[PDB]
Amino acid sequence: GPPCCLYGSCRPFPGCYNALCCRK
Protein backbone atom coordinates (compact mmCIF):
# COMPACT_ATOMS: atom_id res chain seq x y z
CA GLY A 1 0.00 0.00 0.00
CA PRO A 2 0.74 3.76 0.35
CA PRO A 3 2.81 5.00 3.49
CA CYS A 4 1.09 5.97 6.69
CA CYS A 5 4.20 7.87 7.78
CA LEU A 6 6.42 9.38 5.11
CA TYR A 7 9.50 10.82 6.84
CA GLY A 8 8.29 10.27 10.48
CA SER A 9 5.02 12.13 9.84
CA CYS A 10 1.20 11.66 10.15
CA ARG A 11 0.22 11.09 6.48
CA PRO A 12 -3.58 10.16 6.39
CA PHE A 13 -4.60 6.82 4.76
CA PRO A 14 -6.84 3.73 5.31
CA GLY A 15 -5.06 1.60 7.85
CA CYS A 16 -2.53 4.35 8.89
CA TYR A 17 -4.27 5.14 12.25
CA ASN A 18 -4.00 1.26 12.75
CA ALA A 19 -0.21 1.34 11.70
CA LEU A 20 2.61 1.71 14.19
CA CYS A 21 4.23 5.23 13.74
CA CYS A 22 0.97 7.37 13.41
CA ARG A 23 -1.11 5.03 15.66
CA LYS A 24 -3.99 7.52 16.17
Side-chain angles (χ1 to χ4, degrees), residues 3-5 10-24:
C4 178
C5 314
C10 280
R11 189 79 56 169
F13 283 108
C16 174
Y17 37 72
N18 195 77
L20 207 292
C21 54
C22 191
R23 203 180 195 182
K24 286 301 297 183

